[PDB]
Amino acid sequence: CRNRFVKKNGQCNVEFTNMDDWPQRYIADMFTTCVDIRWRYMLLLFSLAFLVSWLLFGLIFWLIALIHGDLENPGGDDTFKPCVLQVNGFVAAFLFSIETQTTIGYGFRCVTEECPLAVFMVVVQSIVGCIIDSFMIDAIMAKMARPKKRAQTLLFSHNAVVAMRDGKLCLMWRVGNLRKSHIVEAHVRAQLIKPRITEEGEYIPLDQIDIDVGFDKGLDRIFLVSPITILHEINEDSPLFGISRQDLETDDFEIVVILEGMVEATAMTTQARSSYLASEILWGHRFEPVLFEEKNQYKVDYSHFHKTYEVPSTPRCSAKDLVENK
Amino acid sequence: CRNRFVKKNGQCNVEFTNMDDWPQRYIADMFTTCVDIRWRYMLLLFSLAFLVSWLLFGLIFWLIALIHGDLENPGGDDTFKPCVLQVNGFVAAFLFSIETQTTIGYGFRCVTEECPLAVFMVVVQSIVGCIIDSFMIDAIMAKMARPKKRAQTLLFSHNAVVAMRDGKLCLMWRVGNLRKSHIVEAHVRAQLIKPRITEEGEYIPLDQIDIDVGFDKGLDRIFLVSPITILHEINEDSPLFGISRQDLETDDFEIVVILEGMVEATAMTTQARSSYLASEILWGHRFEPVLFEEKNQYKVDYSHFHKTYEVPSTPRCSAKDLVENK
Amino acid sequence: CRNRFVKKNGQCNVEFTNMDDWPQRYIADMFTTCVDIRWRYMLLLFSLAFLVSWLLFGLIFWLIALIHGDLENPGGDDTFKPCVLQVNGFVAAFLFSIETQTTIGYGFRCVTEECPLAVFMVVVQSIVGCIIDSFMIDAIMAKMARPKKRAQTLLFSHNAVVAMRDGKLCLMWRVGNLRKSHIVEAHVRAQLIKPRITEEGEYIPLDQIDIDVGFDKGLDRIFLVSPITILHEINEDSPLFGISRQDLETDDFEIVVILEGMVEATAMTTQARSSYLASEILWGHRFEPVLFEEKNQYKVDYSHFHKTYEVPSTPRCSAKDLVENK
Amino acid sequence: CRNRFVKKNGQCNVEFTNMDDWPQRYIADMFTTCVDIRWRYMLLLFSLAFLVSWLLFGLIFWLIALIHGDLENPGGDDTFKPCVLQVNGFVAAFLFSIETQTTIGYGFRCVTEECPLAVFMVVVQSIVGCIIDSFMIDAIMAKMARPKKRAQTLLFSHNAVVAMRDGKLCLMWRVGNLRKSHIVEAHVRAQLIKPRITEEGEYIPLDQIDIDVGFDKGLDRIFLVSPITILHEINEDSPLFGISRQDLETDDFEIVVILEGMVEATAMTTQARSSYLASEILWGHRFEPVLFEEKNQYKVDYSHFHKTYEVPSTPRCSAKDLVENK
Ligand SMILES: [K+]
Ligand SMILES: [K+]
Ligand SMILES: [K+]
Ligand SMILES: [K+]
Ligand SMILES: [K+]
Ligand SMILES: [K+]
């Protein structure tokens, strides 16, 4: 029943409220804010930064021309020389500004030697334009690179299963790579999520309890070429020790699964996520194989990635009762 | 009493003195120096690099024009052709330099085919301008990206508490994320800081003693969506084993807490810090919940993040006496 | 017999099929796709992005000139002023577009103050050109940096060997650095690859079984200056415990070896790989030394890197029988 | 006597010879080569790339002008229009090439609409110039960022010492940060380096044997604000277990020390190194303190960083004999 902490696609279902002092923090941590806000708003924010600087300097060059009297004699002559040739109005001043900062510089409109202030504005604008260009480029460059996107081409199975492997009752789920490029330093985690009351009567809204998948022997570290089935041996130390098939079909909990590792190309860590409600766990099932031998290679059939099949010999009791008996 | 090693905001309160050979080291490690020095001074340092190069080449082009006799006939004619059209003085030479290096190139001032030296300067300046532009861009790009800034949007609680959980006396503190973007490969550390004399009579000004929060089982690794309460079970192996409530209110020590993990966007490791003096630790208290169930999601009420409430049933004695008795 | 999971050069021999929904995923994870597709196609893709944008804006400027009547009077006069000087046809419009977006801006063709639409196109194109330039630069920058390339200058030996060291039967293989720059945070892994049927009758096409090389004591972490010989002590916990020399020469399995660590320069993790078929493992052999003392240094003779030599005293039985006897 | 594997400044003293196939590998791993070769040669290599491309296209534009007959009528007239205005010789063609690729584009020399080949060269050169600019920028950007440089501002002590702490005989050495910016995820390693013959008579030129500094409890992980003294408890599992003071003064071995961690700014892992010959280890000594209490802070006196002082109560026998007796 209880709605889920994290969805099948990995997105976490939690909203933060009464975080009143956030704008001051988001300002101090601005580069972070900027790479998170969605494309449309960023490209717009940087369009504004150009437009604003272009209009700003455009105005200054216009003022200089207004004061110097260039608007009445913009081409100059033998006696009179303007600060900037051909600034005859605001649009021309705007054009000169864009031409200068972009560094297009068609040159019909052109700064002269006459006005040290105009020369200074060209100096300052050039330097400002380099700074702004850097900021844009960077933000775009960072945002482009964001390795969270790699989780789209990493795949968890829709279902987890419980079944016997090598004499032990195990929780299992599957993970796969939809690319030729590897996930480097790849390793996995899992957590049981449920509310809990401590023996001292403390209510934990959602306690996160570790699901052991081999950390202590380094077996949480995986080298995934073809899809792999992750194993959680359900034993005395597991929080599913007393969970039988009957319990599972009526119980209310969640199992969050995580795959972390580096995108081979950029060597930046991504974190793929998914989840399994107690209802989505299939007792007495196993995954259908996807790897098979070829003439000169192996092949993975991703059509059979999510598919499972029942195993009647699977005990229906919990792992506690399975050992309590024998 | 004793002033603190690290402040609540994470900044470390230590000054380095008699580090006499630092400038030679800071030069060899220059990129590091440059990204650390504050914005104002960096933007100024790069403004100078442009201005210096602009003035430098400006001077050379002026000298060439002076020697070649272009200052007396800058437009040239049927018989005489200058090295650079329209370099009539220093300002013009300066303008040509800026126009060339920025690559604005209005073109009224324009290099000719006549002087192999002028042609060589345009070649060298162009190449110098690319180098300098790279250096600026980079520094700005690095400095912009600095992931320490992410610690502003990560939150430790103002207080740590001591209380019973699941039959064990525990030190606790809370950590939270003020963003939707995750901290990847997130994990926590803690250290007790105090002076110490060894049995051999050695004085350690500030010994740093580990506060176990689950490293040996990988439980120091956390997946924080909603705020989490970090647990240090106070047992025989803990350095707070013999610390009772009475001791805590009169004792003088510090507990430094660290949260490390990667900014999801850039996948760069940040290190959030805070601290708790013995006085700031609240014995017999617990944190008020912030996570609650909604219709279709969960919600975190950050107004109640720092709030605590007393628990009278909490034993007042140390964990040593708690086990010495039973 | 069975063909190998991963080749000597580290490339994995697996093809993914029936991955039907890949284009939608590869689009959402586009930056990843782009850095993977080989140079030729990327440089072409970015050549198209310029050409397309250049043609696009070229067409718009031409339309403006067509409508405004500039094609009949492109230089303008005392009464008539064009939107863009000297746009006399499509090629001229194309030239103006390239000149503007590249920001070359020769200026013979030059935007005027007359047409707010032309002024707007110059604004939009400039901003589009900055965006596109960023995307190109980035992709090229990422692709250039790709640290997988570092595996070319890291070397596994062609053969693994089995031999006695310090009273224990050990699997061994060698690793080496072909550069002066180090591999930082370097560490090693190994896995036995073979098909397997579980006692419950489940077929695992290729189970991956850990080959212990010292993870639990941190001895998998290596500091490689000169070549190093990696050791897998074959003991009760090893999956080669019951493998004797006779078994090895007739058995069918694979040993995949991995060296992970960061390129000192970029501090990006690379993952060098190789493999050993059961046939490629030389029982009763040891590697010939390559490090020798010099006058003022040490020297590595990479000619003798792969060379081995037999040791008759090596027991021919498995490590199980070696301990079963004594 | 035997010369040392790694020097006090961290540089490793090993030369690689008979690495015959290196150029083909260094080519495949080119980005790596490029960032390693020293500044002077890189800046020169990129100067050549510009010069080469500038000369190349310069030549093509000249050929076009030669064939089209522009060299005889470079300004054009009412009947004749050149491919590129004012290309009157090679220097002019060279100038036009530089002007175009740099995108300075003074414009006196200017491509026309006349020659589709000239228009194509401007297109191709622009695109080539963007590519080359990217390569340069990148290389410079990577090389600039190289985090090895951070090891200059990290400090090992000149000496290691042996002394008693808390009832155990310990090897000790000191590490320090010469910056305000932290080393994130900082941790330490150590290795004993000496030649060795195995009981099976195998000669290991330089075996590397781990010096335990707390890996198994995570105590190798350090949070260094002020300088820290690293401890290696010399016990039964240590390879210095049977080393007494007398042995140390006549013995021949080396102790390599490593500090790894991320530069806070760039979050890139650096690896500081140093070494101690058996002669450089001071038995019965301890380091002088450098941290002392101030009014409102702490202060580190780096003048006393390397200084030690004797402790007569230090046992002169090995840790083996120290426990063999009691
Ligand atoms: K121009
Ligand atoms: K970058
Ligand atoms: K220009
Ligand atoms: K011009
Ligand atoms: K330009
Ligand atoms: K121009």
Key terms:
inward rectifier potassium channel activity (chains A, B, C, D), 31% helix, 2 domains, potassium (chains A, B, C, D), Helix Hairpins, 4-stranded antiparallel β-sheet, voltage-gated channel (chains A, B, C, D), homotetramer, 7 helices, disulfide bond (chains A, B, C, D), Immunoglobulin-like, ATP-sensitive inward rectifier potassium channel 12 (chains A, B, C, D), binds potassium ion, 326 residues
Q: CATH homologous superfamily of the largest domain in chain A - what is it? A: G protein-activated inward rectifier potassium channel 1
How many strands of chain A?
16
Oligomer: homotetramer
Which CATH-level-2 architecture of the largest domain in chain A? Sandwich
Measured distance between first and last alpha carbons of chain A: 35 Å
**CATH overall fold name of the largest domain in chain A:** Immunoglobulin-like
SSE series of chain A: EHHHEHEHEEEEEEHEEEEEEEH
The level-1 CATH class of the largest domain in chain A: Mainly Beta
Structural class of chain A: alpha+beta
* Percent range for β-strand residues of chain A: 25-35%
Radius of gyration of chain A over all CA atoms, rounded: 32 Å
- Helical residue percent of chain A? 25-40%
Please tally the helical runs of chain A, counting DSSP H or I stretches of 4 or more residues.
7
| Largest protein-protein interface | A-B, 73 and 80 residues
Please outline the major beta sheet of chain A: 5 strands, mixed
| Shape field of chain A | elongated
Total number of distinct structural domains of chain A: 2
**Small-molecule binders:** potassium ion
Extracellular side (chains A, B, C, D): 64-89, 107-115
Main location (chains A, B, C, D): membrane
Subcellular location (chains A, B, C, D): Membrane; Cell membrane; Cell membrane, Sarcolemma, T-tubule
Family (chains A, B, C, D): Belongs to the inward rectifier-type potassium channel family.
